Amino acid sequence: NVEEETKYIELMIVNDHLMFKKHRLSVVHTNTYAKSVVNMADLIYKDQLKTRIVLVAMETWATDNKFAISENPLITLREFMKYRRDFIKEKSDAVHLFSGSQFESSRSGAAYIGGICSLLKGGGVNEFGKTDLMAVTLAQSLAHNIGIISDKRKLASGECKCEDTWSGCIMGDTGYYLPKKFTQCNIEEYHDFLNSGGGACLFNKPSKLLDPPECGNGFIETGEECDCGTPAECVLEGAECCKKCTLTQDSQCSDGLCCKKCKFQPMGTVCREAVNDCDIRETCSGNSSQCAPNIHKMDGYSCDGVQGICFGGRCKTRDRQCKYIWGQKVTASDKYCYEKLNIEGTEKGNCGKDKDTWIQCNKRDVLCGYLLCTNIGNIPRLGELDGEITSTLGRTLNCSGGHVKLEEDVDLGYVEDGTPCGPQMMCLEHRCLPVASFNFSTCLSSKEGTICSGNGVCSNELKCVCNRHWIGSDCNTYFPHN
Amino acid sequence: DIFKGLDSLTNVDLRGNSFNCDCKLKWLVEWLGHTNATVEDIYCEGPPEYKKRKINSLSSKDFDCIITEFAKSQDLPYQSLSIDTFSYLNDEYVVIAQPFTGKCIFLEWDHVEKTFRNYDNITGTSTVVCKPIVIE
C-alpha cells in the first residue's frame, strides 16, 4: 500500500560558518561530511520506515552567518526557518539546519512535530556534534517533522516502550551509546500521519543528487537509463526489468508499482488509493513507470458536508483537534459548552490568549474560542499545560479544555485556524471568518460558483483532476475511451 | 651463557677488555659464582652504578632487572563495563558491572584455588558503573 511504498524525502542541509571554521574552512570536507551524515540517517530510516532521505542540495556559509545566531534553540530555529522562507526556493521535502552554535538546551535538535511538506515548517535545526551524534540528531529531527515523537501518555502508562532497553532509544535524550531500533509507536505514528494525508511530498524520486552517477544506488539518476539497485536485492524486485543498470533485451521499466512483471500495466489502474476523503486516487499515466504525483484536496475542501476541512491533505475537525491534542479517546464537546463557556469566563472560555484580560467571544460564533473536548486525560500526548487543565461540568456533559503548547509560539490549547464554524465559516486568528479572509484561489472553472465545471475536484496544485472519461482540462468535454 | 657451550677448560684471560655490566651480562657474574678455571678479572665500564672493580666480586642484586609478565587466567564469561576494586573486611572485593543485564557482581579472592570467588549480586536494568566506597 501507500505505507509499504518507498518514501523519498528530499532533504536539503543549511550549514552555518561555526562548524565550517571548526572543519578547517574546507568546503569539500563539509560536503562529504554532510553526504556521510545523510547516508547514515538513511541507513537508520531504511530498516523500519522504508524511507530514503535524498540529499537534493546543501548550502554551507564559508563567509559568515547571515542572521542573528543565539543559543536559544527556538529563536535560532525561527531565524533559520524565516531565512529559508525568504531566500531558499528550491523544492525540498525537508530543510534541515546543521547548527554550528551548539544549543544551550537539554534537547539535541529542535524540529517541528508533523511539520514536513510545509514551506514554513518543513525541517528543523540540528546543533553541532560528532558525526554519529548529529546523524542521530538529524534522525530524531526528521522523525519530529514526520509526526514521529515519543508518546508521553504511553510512556507514563507503559503502553509502548523502547525495545533497546540497553541504552534507550533514539527519540529520548541522546545518550553517548546510540541504539539501533525504533519503537513500534514510531511506525504507528508514521501510518497515522501518512493516512491523515501529511507528508504527501515524500513520494517523488529526484533525478539529480549530490552523489555522482553510481550504479545500483536505488535511484535512476543522470546517466542511468535504468536502476534496479544492487543485483543482490534486484532478484526480489525488478529481476527481469533492469540488470547491472542496463535493460534486459526488450524492457520498459526498472521498478515501480505502475509496471508489473517489467511490463506496462493497463490504463486506469490506481497506483495509490486515497488515504481519506482529503486524498485523490492516483492513476498511472500509461507510459510512466513511477506512480502519479501525489495530489490531495485543495486547502479549504471539507472532509464532510459541513464539518471538517482538508488543509495540506490533512483533515481538521474539532474532534480531530481533540484527538491530536489530547488523545484518541478524547472527543470534541457539544455546542452546549461552546456557548456556555466561551461567552464569559476565565481559563474556561477564551478567544485570544490574554492572561490579564481574556478576550470575549460573541454569540454569533463560539467554535473558534477555547477548544472544549470530552473526557480529557491526565496528560496530553504532546505539549505542556499552562497551569492546570480546565474542567467544567437536561443533559450532563464532562466538559474540559486546556492550553497545550508546543516548541512554536502557536498555542494548541485553542482551536487551530481553519476549523469550520458553519458554511464557509472557519477559524482565523481565533475567530470564525469567511473564505475571503484566507483568500483561497479559484480552480479552473467554467460555470458560475462551481469547481472544475461542477463535476470534478481540484487537486492541491490548483489543477483540475476530472472524473472518469473526462479528458478536458476544465472538465468540459467528454471523450469515451477503452 | 655462551661460556658453557664448551665443556673442558682451564684458563680464560680478561685484561684490558671493556664491558658494560648490565642485567643481561649479569649471567657472567652468576657464572663467576660457579667458575673454577684460572681467570683474571679486569675492569668493567658500563652503567655508572658499577665503579672500577672486579666483575667476580659483583653480586646478582646489583642488577635490579625484575622481569614482569602476565599469565592468563580467563574464567569470567560475563561482559563488563566497570571493574573497580576496594579493600573491605580484610578482603579487597572486585565489583563488576555487566552490560545488557543490569547485574552488579562481587568477587572475593580465596586461596583455595588461587582465584576470586563470586558471592553477591545486585538488581538493575543495564549496569554501567558500580563505584564502591567504604566509609565507616
UniProtKB/Swiss-Prot annotation, chain A:
Effect of residue 169 to Y: In DEE61; uncertain significance; loss of interaction with LGI1; no effect on DLG4-binding, nor on subcellular location
Residues annotated as domain EGF-like: 439-476
Cell compartment(s), UniProt: Cell membrane; Cell projection, Axon
UniProt PTM comment: The precursor is cleaved by a furin endopeptidase.
Intrachain S-S bonds: 117-201, 160-185, 162-169, 215-245, 226-242, 228-234, 241-262, 253-259, 258-284, 271-291, 278-310, 303-315, 322-373, 337-399, 351-361, 368-427, 421-432, 443-458, 452-464, 466-475
Disease implicated: Developmental and epileptic encephalopathy 61: A form of epileptic encephalopathy, a heterogeneous group of severe early-onset epilepsies characterized by refractory seizures, neurodevelopmental impairment, and poor prognosis. Development is normal prior to seizure onset, after which cognitive and motor delays become apparent. DEE61 is an autosomal recessive condition characterized by onset of seizures in infancy.
Protein name: Disintegrin and metalloproteinase domain-containing protein 22
Organism ancestry: Eukaryota, Metazoa, Chordata, Craniata, Vertebrata
Name of the gene this protein is made from: ADAM22
Full-protein residues shown: 233 to 718 of 906
Curated annotation (Swiss-Prot), chain B:
All residue ranges annotated as the LRRCT domain in the record: 17-67
Glycan attachment sites: 36, 121
Induction of synthesis: Down-regulated in neuroblastoma cells.
Effect upon mutating residue 76 to P: In ETL1; loss of protein secretion
Name of the protein in question: Leucine-rich glioma-inactivated protein 1
Tissue: Predominantly expressed in neural tissues, especially in brain. Expression is reduced in low-grade brain tumors and significantly reduced or absent in malignant gliomas.
Subunit annotation: Oligomer. Interacts with KCNA1 within a complex containing KCNA1, KCNA4 and KCNAB1. Part of a complex containing ADAM22, DLG4/PSD95 and CACNG2/Stargazin. Can bind to ADAM11 and ADAM23.
Organism whose genome encodes this protein: Homo sapiens
Region of the whole protein represented: 157 to 292 of 557
